[PDB]
């Protein structure tokens, strides 16, 4: 089964591998991302939804009256997207939102409602998104690209020991909002923990713990133990746990029931433990000198003194112990502590902490935060409130606050927004935890802690920061009494809100104009993720690690595909079957396997959960029921691959292409090319330029009509139907009945794009590619766009190449091009640029856009019509006038002179001068395109009449196409129910239809249905006529223009480029080059029937480079080539068409248990004709990206065109007719022109303008400027010792004013010979350091 | 407006082993140089600017040529001599 | 603010949260007036373009187009066109050159007869990159440049630019002629060494004609001088390649300094006796009489500089580029893809080596070993197995059997299209040749460890996901650290030129 644009010509696939997953919708990033911003959410948690819900209630100071969100509502746009793109403004839509203002009174219990107030009010535009993906931004085609940034939460580091010269590491935390403050917890060579706030000065970790009312012993209590020895009346004998022994040494005699478990210099070990526990040994006698170096936990008083013995978090010593004797208490409490583990930081910490109460750790941290300014309790507490405790400030978001529970190995994914005591606490244990030696850190490149953020997101986030401006002016105009008339229109003004959303669109550093050069620069453009932006990295301070390949990108970042340059790594693309999850991290889609079985349930598997499994390679053989046929297969399991068993596997891939992007998935013999090559190729692809005629690459992977489809540059029928009307620029589909709707006409009209200028001054055009009367279905192709050949995507042209050295001319990547393919039109483009004229209102009057010019000749007026405006089909050069204006030159003193002038000249040459638009020099082209925009008010001339009805008639047809279908069955309708009933048989029919309609009949209900038909047939004419009427007004609306602009002209020329030496050529294996030569047709080499070929590349250009791919396609081609000439052959000489169908079944069933099935049993002779005459140029063949063809089963394909197995043959010279003497590989390969054109690249200068300050030539070739000659050229020259040289080419050819003149006038006399003077720079610089207060002088 | 400004400021102090020890690329290119490898405007040439152009290109006396320096500055932009040769 | 804005505290902005740049701004940095507008500039008189490759220029000459060459040199046509009395007056010279008629562009060809014009490739790096060259002008709108200053220039021909200066005054004129003309710039200043040796398709072409094969068309005959010989050649009567006695005169440079010649008949090919044709007196035969690849070409430019000077070897220069591009030309030498022939033990040593993978693996769950030292030997085995697997297919590409004269078997080295490329030294190693078509081997992951298991599929065969994927993390790694190291670089060559800027003998 085939559809009908694929049976046309079907692509022979050497693919062997079953596909059990289609390859998605390639656009659906941007799609989903802004239908989540923009549909109606019911909670609050995505879009406009959540963010109004995230301001609203706005509640006054005073707390009597407040604002209250309802709902909103979106509103039809005025114009259509192609209308806005003609029209030059912004495709979006209103925002209505449904406010509600109630009033509270006063001394009442809650709030009494003293009166409320609804209205609807008007927040602004918001701009829409295509079908595409794209925004139509003043009429441009914009594209906003996705970000891939750091994930909220808690991230846990440590330096590899290189700050310190000593090795060490020290580690650190970070706590970072969706929006809000930074939090940083570091430890110090010294094991101090410290706490940073938004990257300010270093501040004590103690200092965070009493700012949140909390004391010393509990501080204690939280972070260390307890340890409790007991007075017994004779040397304090204590009950002692086993497990605190543990890597220790006893410095004393251990005993306890008449046994001395550890000696004094015995250390304790792992049997003595098992002892002690088995023994259940508590009682334990020490010494006095054992409590010399503990630490006391709490405070302890004297009863009978009443004093305090010691403070918390103290050392203790024999006097001490002695007072506590004596003091009655029985119980001291010590830290349990250690070296290796159990390590002391709280108490060190709190010894260095300055503070030792709550109040003035608020005070300091508000000096940390805000120094230079008197400190107050109640705004240190506001602030420190403020900075992490509040909803307005600080915003965890759900993301952030699951990344922070799954961080800490909570139980809950859900919680609050904001920190807590318990959050700090936690990232303090583990971070000491991570000290103490146990414990990992964070892997921060890791794709499960970086996220995807798409376009729906940071509209949200630019619109919330718009509504917060609104929400802070209308409290700021709530507080005074008016609220008896207020309304809430009144109180709300939508420019700021506006304005962020115009700004967000048109200004960021993710949106940018469209690359437009091919259908793939489209598609890759949408793709695109960068690390860059505002929240992303910058190229200087980005790193080296974050440019890398990690494992965890297998499946969602291509490996391949990314800009070589400054950003290396920070641009990825996305792969093909990738997509993310609901909070923003990428997965992808895994067949399961269950007992040995692979399934055909699919699941998507993210980055963290990936690596808990074992996954199997897509190259693995399998049995017909799903079976493993070997035992032992690679898979990767932890990051990294190996061999496993045939039951340990639990996941498989699901293709052979799930690694790669979309753009690498286009070359063929990828898996036979070097990486960097196929980086250059991938990179190259995408800036090839369209050509005339689109030519199918003929060696393909049969990805190229998902891209030609995706991409949206070609017409998809909407509806299944008959062709009903086909043209050159339109198409009318006639539904067929069952897809049709009730009570309505079934057709569908489709109008081409024709010759329209593109972003990168290129043509875009369609054509159609369906017959009169034939059969569509859903989803068919009815047009090509650009660079698109029946549906298939076709960037370049299908060439004969030979691998040879020729005579130096294809030296160092050089090419050497036939004078056929030049005569063949084979590689020219075509370009369209456009020209403005503006014309303004000044003080002395408006500029007129004119034909009569007063100082110009007749013949210079020749191609301008009577409104002043070139026609369309002129062919003009540099210098020619295209608008004719002219500008008034004020009031002059009628002198005697100026009324002579007057008198004999005339009137209008002594009133206004020439300002028209000519074609700047060196342009050349035809004219295709005028437009006019007129403001309101204005009155329109001629051109712009003319232009409005053209625009006129287009709808006029297509409403009256609809109208005649609609009419036609109401009046055979009306015929119908006329025969039943007084049947006039021929008298009837004689008539026209109208006629019909006056004619009476018997009081039965024939009448009655007459009058209802006639009814009818008058409310569809007067439907028609208000269709009519709206297209009109919408059509002839004025245009909203710039301030002081009256009236503006754009005109569009196009021309065409040829192939010559200079111009830039790639295939897509990274092999570029540029053409040296144009051959005449008899210098080419030739073969033994004489044909010569296209292209001559040098072979000495593949081994170094080992990109072995295109020899493997040139043998491929020129076995397809084959197959096309036995087709062709056999077409010439009339053949039966059992014959064709004989051979071509025979070519699509050769491989070796390719998945493909082709029966032409089940085809038509017609359609078995018509794919004959479409395959008669070569068969198109397929090679997927890692399961293409191999060399067995080219060899079988060159057999079976009869063609040589190692793909070589003799050729002989053109200009002496002798054999070379080795053979030489000949076939065909798919070469691209790209956007390097040496039109646009030539430049040359004599002399010019040059810059007012500094006196110098300026720069570009749009200012005809010169060339740059820097320090290293001036090093080169004083290496040379070329004195003369560098001082002419410093004073007289750049800024040596006088120097300059005379250097030309002693040229033009025949004197080689300057007088070089001071530059003017330095006099400058001169000016600018006295101008700092400082005398510089030029002495003597 | 005003803002804070406290970043550090690269100078030439940095040695040579530093920058290659350094993973971070520079933030402007020490070498005159590209990525690849305050607006003024621009002098305009007038009427009297072109006459002056060709009183120069032409063979003149020094008497002649202040005479010409004179007659061209006497020059309006309508192309007529404002004042008699008196 | 209005002295240094920004140094002490906050900085003012402008409206779009800018800072405001002040008279010091104005005066340092990157953009002030120092490095932008005084240490260089931009001048005029001066043009760019893309290069291509002229393969019949001398070396010095170079390819000019004539539309950059109209605009350059206006002020010349003007003053040659009024001193022939084409023009009375300078608007009759601007209105004739902005026609274009056919007399200006005789005075274009009479005006660049003898004036250099300096040629520059970005970036500098040291003073070869500025030279000089007379004009031809051309058609079209390319620069051509001569095949021989491309490593100079370090230049190819994939889209590249140069820009075009020229020298006004005499002074200029004449030091670029003879200062900084390419014919004079010969040598490296850097170490001494002939900077101007050929590469690629002339070694090609010169190692394939000076090769000999065991059982050739016309072996064996005696020739009475090179002449014969072409004429042999030529005629289809003998191969290039045959050996035979040709009989050769030689000249030798005497104490006093004459030239003395002698004559005997010497065992030789016909591709040698007809290279010695373009040698110029002085040399002896034996330079010629053996495969010539690149080394063997430098060190014969050499000998002729050294003995004769500087004109003959720049003569010499030009007839190899010659002969090498005509005779790689004639040869026909293509790349297919059973050049890469793979030796047929390959399998055989990946699968002894995975056996004792296998084996140590179970010796180490045996418990009998720690991981490091099975992993140590796990890398030995791999490295061993490639090597063997290098060897084995450099030994079988290299060699390649031959019938006798009499009916015989014998061995001779290959003549396989890459073996020749990579023993010549046109292009190509043996690490590229062990990765087309041997294996890739041992692998690295980006902190630098080596992955136990190496790729064991080559270029021809081709890779599967998971071979690749581990390719790509070399490539990038090394991609962007190419990427960097320039920046830093350019800091070294700074700091050098400026600690020794003023040191003059
Ligand atoms: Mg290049």
């Given at each position: 089964?085939?559809?009908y644009?694929?049976?046309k ?19 659906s990033?941007?799609?989903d ?24 209630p706005?509640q ?7 604002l209250?969100?309802?709902s ?8 259509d997207?192609?209308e806005?793109?003609?029209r ?6 209103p ?8 009033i509270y009174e006063?001394?009442?219990?809650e ?10 009010v008007?927040?602004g535009?918001?701009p ?5 993906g ?7 085609e ?6 891939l940034?750091?994930?909220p939460?808690?991230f846990?580091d ?17 706590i970072?909002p969706?929006?809000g403050?930074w939090?940083?917890?570091e430890?110090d060579?010294?094991?101090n923990?410290?706490?940073?706030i ?17 004391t ?6 939280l ?6 020895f007991?007075?017994?009346?004779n040397?304090l ?13 006893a410095?004393?005699?251990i005993?306890a029931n008449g ?9 304790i ?6 002892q ?29 003194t009443?004093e ?18 004596q003091?009655?208490?029985?119980r001291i409490?010590?830290?349990f ?9 709280i ?17 300091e ?10 400190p ?9 409130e ?9 915003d965890?978001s759900?993301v ?15 919680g ?7 959050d700090?606490?936690d990232?303090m244990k ?18 499960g ?6 376009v729906?997101?940071?509209?949200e ?16 105009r ?6 008896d ?6 109180m709300?003004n939508?420019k ?10 048109g200004?960021?550093?993710?949106s ?13 453009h949408k ?16 790193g080296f690690?974050?440019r890398?390949?990690?494992?965890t990108?297998?499946?969602r ?5 990314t ?6 790594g920070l ?6 079957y ?5 909070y ?6 895994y ?9 055909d349930?699919?699941?998507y598997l993210s980055?963290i ?8 390679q897509?190259?693995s053989n399998?049995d ?42 286009l070359?063929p ?8 090559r ?24 049969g ?40 009570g309505?006409?079934?057709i ?18 369609q ?8 059969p569509?279905?859903?989803?068919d ?5 650009p ?5 298939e ?7 004969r190449v ?5 005579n130096?001319?294809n ?6 091009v ?7 039109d084979?590689?020219?483009?075509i ?5 403005a004229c ?6 002395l ?6 034909a ?20 369309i089909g ?20 009628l002198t ?6 007057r008198?004999?000249?005339?009137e209008?040459?002594?009133d ?19 437009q006019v ?20 008639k ?7 196409e ?8 109401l ?6 129910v006329?025969?039943?009933g007084?049947?006039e ?5 004689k ?5 019909w ?8 209900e024939?009448?009655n249905?007459?009058e ?12 028609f ?8 007004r ?9 301030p ?7 005109v ?16 897509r294996?990274?092999n ?10 008899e ?8 044909t010569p070929?296209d ?6 250009g ?7 791919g295109?020899?493997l ?9 084959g197959?096309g000439?036995?087709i ?43 794919l004959?005459?479409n395959?008669?140029?070569?068969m ?20 079976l ?5 190692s ?17 030489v ?8 022109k ?10 040359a200068?004599?002399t010019?303008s ?6 110098q ?13 820097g ?10 010792g070329?004195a003369?040289?560098?001082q ?6 750049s800024?040596?004013?006088?120097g300059?003149?005379?250097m ?29 207060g ?7 | ?25 520079p933030?402007?290119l020490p070498l ?9 405007g621009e002098?305009?040439?007038?009427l009297?600017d ?5 009183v120069?290109?032409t063979?003149?006396?020094?008497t002649?040529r ?6 061209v500055?006497?020059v ?5 001599l ?5 | ?7 002490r505290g906050?900085?003012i902005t ?13 005066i ?12 260089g500039?931009?001048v005029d ?6 290069i291509?490759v002229?393969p019949?220029?001398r070396?010095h ?6 539309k ?5 040199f ?5 003053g ?8 009375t ?15 200006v ?6 005006v ?11 970036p ?6 500025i030279?000089?060259?007379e004009?031809?002008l ?11 200053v ?8 994939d889209?590249?630019?140069?820009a075009?200066?020229?020298?006004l ?14 014919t004079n710039?010969i040598?490296?200043?850097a170490?001494?060494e ?6 690629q398709d ?7 004609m ?5 059982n050739?068309?016309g ?19 003998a ?6 006695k040709?009989?050769?005169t ?15 008949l ?6 040698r ?8 007196k002085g ?9 010539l690849?690149?080394?063997?070409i ?16 720049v003569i ?12 790689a ?24 080596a ?7 693996q179970?010796?180490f ?15 030995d085995?791999?490295?061993?197995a490639?090597?063997?697997?290098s ?10 059997t ?5 009916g015989?078997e014998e061995?001779?080295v290959?003549?396989?299209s890459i073996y ?12 590229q040749?062990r990765?087309?078509?041997?294996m ?5 992951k ?6 136990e298991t190496?790729?064991?599929?080559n270029?021809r065969?081709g890779?599967?996901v998971?071979?690749?994927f581990?390719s ?6 090394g ?11 350019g ?6 030129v ?8």
């Amino acid at each position: 089964v085939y559809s009908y644009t694929e049976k046309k010509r079907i692509r022979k696939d050497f693919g062997k591998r079953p596909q059990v997953l289609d390859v998605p919708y390639l656009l659906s990033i941007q799609l989903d991302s802004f239908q989540k911003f923009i549909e109606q959410d019911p909670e609050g948690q995505y879009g406009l939804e959540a963010a109004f819900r995230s301001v609203f209630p706005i509640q006054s100071y005073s707390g009597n009256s407040e604002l209250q969100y309802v709902s909103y509502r979106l509103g039809e746009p005025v114009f259509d997207v192609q209308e806005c793109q003609i029209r030059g403004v912004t495709y979006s839509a209103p925002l209505r939102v449904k406010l509600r203002l109630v009033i509270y009174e006063r001394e009442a219990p809650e709030g009494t409602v003293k009166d409320i107030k609804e209205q609807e009010v008007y927040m602004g535009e918001i701009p829409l998104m295509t079908d595409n993906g794209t925004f139509v931004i003043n009429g441009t085609e914009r594209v906003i690209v996705s970000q891939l940034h750091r994930s909220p939460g808690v991230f846990f580091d440590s330096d590899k020991g290189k700050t310190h010269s000593s090795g060490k590491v020290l580690y650190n935390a970070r706590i970072i909002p969706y929006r809000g403050s930074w939090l940083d917890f570091e430890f110090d060579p010294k094991d101090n923990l410290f706490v940073r706030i938004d990257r300010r000065r270093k501040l004590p970790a103690t200092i965070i713990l009493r700012a949140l009312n909390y004391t010393t012993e509990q501080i204690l209590d939280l972070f260390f133990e307890k340890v409790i020895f007991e007075i017994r009346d004779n040397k304090l004998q204590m009950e002692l746990v086993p497990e605190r022994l543990r890597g220790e040494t006893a410095s004393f005699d251990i005993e306890a029931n008449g046994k001395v478990y550890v000696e004094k210099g015995r250390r304790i070990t792992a049997r003595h433990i098992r002892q002690l526990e088995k023994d259940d040994v508590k009682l334990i006698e020490v010494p006095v000198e054992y409590i010399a170096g503990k630490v006391v936990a709490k405070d302890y008083i004297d009863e009978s003194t009443g004093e305090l013995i010691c403070a918390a978090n103290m050392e203790l010593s024999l006097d001490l112990l002695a007072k506590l004797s004596q003091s009655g208490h029985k119980r001291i409490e010590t830290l349990f502590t250690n070296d290796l583990d159990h390590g002391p930081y709280i108490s060190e910490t709190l010894r260095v902490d300055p503070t030792n109460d709550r109040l003035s750790a608020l005070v300091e941290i508000y000096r940390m935060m805000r120094p230079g300014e008197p400190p107050t309790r109640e705004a240190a507490e506001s602030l420190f409130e403020n900075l992490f405790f509040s909803e307005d400030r600080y915003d965890l978001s759900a993301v952030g606050r699951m990344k922070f529970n799954r961080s800490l190995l909570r139980e809950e994914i859900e919680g609050s927004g904001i920190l807590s005591k318990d959050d700090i606490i936690d990232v303090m244990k583990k971070l000491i935890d991570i000290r103490n030696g146990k414990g990992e850190v964070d892997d921060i490149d890791h794709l499960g802690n970086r996220r995807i953020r798409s376009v729906g997101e940071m509209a949200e986030n630019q619109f919330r920061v718009g509504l917060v401006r609104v929400e802070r002016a209308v409290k700021e105009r709530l507080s005074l009494g008016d609220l008896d008339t207020l309304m809430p229109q009144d109180m709300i003004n939508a420019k700021p809100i506006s304005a962020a959303v115009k700004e967000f669109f048109g200004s960021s550093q993710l949106s940018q104009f469209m690359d437009q050069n091919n259908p793939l620069s489209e598609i890759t453009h949408k793709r695109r993720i960068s690390a860059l932006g505002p929240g992303g990295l910058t190229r200087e301070r980005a790193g080296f690690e974050v440019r890398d390949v990690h494992p965890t990108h297998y499946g969602r970042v291509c490996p391949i595909e990314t800009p070589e340059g400054p950003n290396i790594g920070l641009i990825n693309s996305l792969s093909v079957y990738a997509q993310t999850n609901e909070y923003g991290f990428l997965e992808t889609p895994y067949r399961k396997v269950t007992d040995g079985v692979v399934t055909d349930e699919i699941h998507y598997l993210s980055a963290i959960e990936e690596g808990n499994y074992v996954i199997a390679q897509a190259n693995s053989n399998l049995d017909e029921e799903g079976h493993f046929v070997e035992d032992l297969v690679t898979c990767r399991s932890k990051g990294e691959s190996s061999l496993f068993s045939r039951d340990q596997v639990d996941y498989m891939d699901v293709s052979t292409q799930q690694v790669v992007s979309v753009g690498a998935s286009l070359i063929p013999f990828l898996e036979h090319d070097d990486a960097n090559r196929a980086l250059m190729g991938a990179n190259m692809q995408r800036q090839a330029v369209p050509t005339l005629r689109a030519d199918k690459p003929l060696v393909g992977t049969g990805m190229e009509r998902a891209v030609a489809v995706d991409s949206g540059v070609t017409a998809v029928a909407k509806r299944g139907g008959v062709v009903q009307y086909v043209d050159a620029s339109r198409i009318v589909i006639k539904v067929n009945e069952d897809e049709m709707y009730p009570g309505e006409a079934g057709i569908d009209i489709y109008n081409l794009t024709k010759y329209t200028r593109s972003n990168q001054n290129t043509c875009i055009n369609q054509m159609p590619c369906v017959s009169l009367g034939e059969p569509v279905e859903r989803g068919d192709v009815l047009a090509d766009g650009p660079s698109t050949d029946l549906g298939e995507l076709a960037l370049g042209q299908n060439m004969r190449v030979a691998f040879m050295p020729w005579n130096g001319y294809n030296f160092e990547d050089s090419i050497l091009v036939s004078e056929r393919v030049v005569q063949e039109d084979r590689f020219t483009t075509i370009h369209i640029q456009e020209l403005a004229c503006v014309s303004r209102d000044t003080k002395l009057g408006p500029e007129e856009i004119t034909a009569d010019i007063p100082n110009v000749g007749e013949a210079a007026l020749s191609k301008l019509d009577e409104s002043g405006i070139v026609y369309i089909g002129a062919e003009v050069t540099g210098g020619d006038i295209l608008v004719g204006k002219v500008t008034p030159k004020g009031e002059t003193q009628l002198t005697p002179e100026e009324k002579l002038l007057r008198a004999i000249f005339g009137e209008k040459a002594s009133d206004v001068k020439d300002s028209s638009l000519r074609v700047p020099n060196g342009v050349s082209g035809t004219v295709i395109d005028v437009q006019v925009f007129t403001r309101d008010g204005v009155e329109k001339d001629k051109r712009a009449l003319e232009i409005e009805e053209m625009q006129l008639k287009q709808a006029k047809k297509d409403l009256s196409e609809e109208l005649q279908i609609l009419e036609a069955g109401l009046f055979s309708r009306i015929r119908a129910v006329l025969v039943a009933g007084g049947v006039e048989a021929e008298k009837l029919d004689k008539l026209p239809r109208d006629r019909w309609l006056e004619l009476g009949l018997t009081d039965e209900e024939k009448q009655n249905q007459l009058e209802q038909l006639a009814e009818q047939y008058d409310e569809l004419k007067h439907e028609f006529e208000k269709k009519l009427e709206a297209k009109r007004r919408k059509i002839t609306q004025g245009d909203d223009l710039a301030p002081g602009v009256l009236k503006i002209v754009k005109v569009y020329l196009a021309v065409k480029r040829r192939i010559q030496p200079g111009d830039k050529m790639a295939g897509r294996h990274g092999n570029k080059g540029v053409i040296s030569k144009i051959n005449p047709i008899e210098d080419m080499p030739y073969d033994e029937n004489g044909t010569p070929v296209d292209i001559v590349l040098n072979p000495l250009g593949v081994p170094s480079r080992m990109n072995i791919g295109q020899i493997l396609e040139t043998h491929l081609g020129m076995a397809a080539k084959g197959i096309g000439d036995k087709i062709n052959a056999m077409l010439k000489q009339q053949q039966e068409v059992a014959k064709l169908r004989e051979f071509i079944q025979r070519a699509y069933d050769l491989g070796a248990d390719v998945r493909q099935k082709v029966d032409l049993s089940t085809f038509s002779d017609e359609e078995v004709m018509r794919l004959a005459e479409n395959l008669r140029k070569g068969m198109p063949i397929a090679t997927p990206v890692f399961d293409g063809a191999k060399e067995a089963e080219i060899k079988e394909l060159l057999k079976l065109g009869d063609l040589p197995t190692s793909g070589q043959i003799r050729l002989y010279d053109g200009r002496t007719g002798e054999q070379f003497e080795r053979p030489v590989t000949v076939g065909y390969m798919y070469m691209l022109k790209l956007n390097h054109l040496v039109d646009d690249k030539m430049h040359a200068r004599s002399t010019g303008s040059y810059s007012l300050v500094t006196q110098q030539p300026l720069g570009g070739k749009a200012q005809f400027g010169g060339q740059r000659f820097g320090e290293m050229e001036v090093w080169a020259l004083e290496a040379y010792g070329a004195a003369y040289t560098l001082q002419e080419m410093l004073t007289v050819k750049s800024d040596d004013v006088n120097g300059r003149t005379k250097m030309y006038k002693n040229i033009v006399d025949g004197n080689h010979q300057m007088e070089p003077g001071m530059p003017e720079s330095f006099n400058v610089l001169l000016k600018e350091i006295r101008s700092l207060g400082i005398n510089i002088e030029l002495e003597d | 407006e005003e803002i804070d400004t406290r970043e550090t400021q690269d100078s030439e102090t940095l040695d040579t082993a530093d920058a290659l020890e350094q993973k971070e690329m520079p933030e402007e290119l020490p070498l005159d140089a590209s990525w690849d490898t305050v607006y003024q405007g621009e002098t305009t040439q007038t009427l009297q600017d072109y006459l002056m152009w060709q009183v120069e290109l032409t063979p003149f006396s020094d008497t002649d040529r202040a005479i010409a320096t004179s007659i061209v500055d006497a020059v309006d932009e309508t192309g007529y001599l404002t004042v008699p040769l008196e | 603010a209005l002295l240094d804005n920004g140094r002490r505290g906050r900085a003012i902005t402008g409206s779009n949260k800018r800072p405001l740049k002040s008279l010091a701004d104005m005066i340092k940095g990157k953009q002030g007036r120092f490095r932008q507008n005084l240490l260089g500039k931009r001048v005029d008189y001066s043009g760019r373009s893309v290069i291509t490759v002229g393969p019949y220029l001398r070396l010095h000459q170079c390819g000019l187009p004539k539309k950059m060459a109209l605009e350059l040199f206006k002020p010349f046509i003007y003053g040659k066109l009024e001193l022939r009395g084409l023009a009375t007056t300078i608007k009759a010279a601007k209105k004739m050159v902005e026609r274009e008629e056919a007399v200006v562009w005789d005075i274009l060809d009479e005006v660049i007869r003898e004036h250099p014009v300096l040629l520059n490739r970005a970036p500098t790096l040291h003073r070869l990159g500025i030279q000089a060259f007379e004009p031809v002008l051309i058609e079209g709108k390319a620069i051509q440049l001569h095949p021989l200053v491309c490593a100079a220039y370090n230049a190819d021909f994939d889209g590249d630019q140069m820009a075009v200066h020229v020298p006004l005054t005499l002074e200029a004129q004449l030091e670029a002629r003879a200062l900084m003309m390419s014919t004079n710039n010969i040598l490296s200043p850097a170490n001494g060494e002939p900077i101007i040796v050929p590469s690629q398709d002339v070694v090609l072409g010169l190692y394939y004609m000076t090769r000999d094969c065991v059982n050739a068309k016309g072996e064996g005959m005696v020739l009475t001088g090179p002449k014969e010989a072409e004429r042999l050649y030529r005629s289809g009567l003998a191969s290039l390649h045959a050996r035979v006695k040709v009989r050769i005169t030689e000249y030798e440079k005497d104490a006093n300094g004459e030239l003395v010649a002698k004559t005997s008949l010497k065992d030789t090919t016909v591709g040698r006796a007809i290279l010695w044709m373009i040698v110029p007196k002085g040399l002896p035969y034996s330079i010629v009489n053996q495969a010539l690849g690149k080394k063997a070409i430098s060190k014969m430019l050499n000998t002729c500089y050294r003995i004769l000077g500087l004109k003959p070897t720049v003569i010499f220069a030009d007839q190899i580029m010659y002969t090498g591009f005509a005779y790689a030309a004639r040869s026909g030498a293509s790349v297919g893809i059973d050049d890469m022939v793979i030796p047929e033990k390959k399998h055989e040593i990946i699968s002894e080596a995975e056996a004792e993978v296998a084996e140590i693996q179970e010796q180490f769950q045996s418990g009998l070993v720690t991981a490091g030292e099975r992993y140590n030997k796990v890398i030995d085995i791999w490295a061993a197995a490639n090597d063997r697997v290098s060897k084995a297919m450099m030994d079988n590409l290299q060699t390649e059997t031959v019938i006798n004269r009499d009916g015989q078997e014998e061995k001779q080295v290959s003549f396989n299209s890459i073996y020749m490329m990579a023993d010549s030294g046109a292009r190509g190693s043996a690490a590229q040749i062990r990765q087309l078509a041997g294996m890739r081997g041992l692998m690295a992951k980006p902190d630098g460890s080596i992955i136990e298991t190496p790729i064991t599929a080559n270029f021809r065969e081709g890779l599967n996901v998971l071979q690749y994927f581990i390719s790509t993390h070399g490539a990038r790694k090394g991609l962007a650290d190419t990427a960097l190291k320039t920046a830093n670089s350019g800091y070294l060559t700074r700091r050098l030129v400026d600690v020794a800027q003023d040191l003059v003998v």
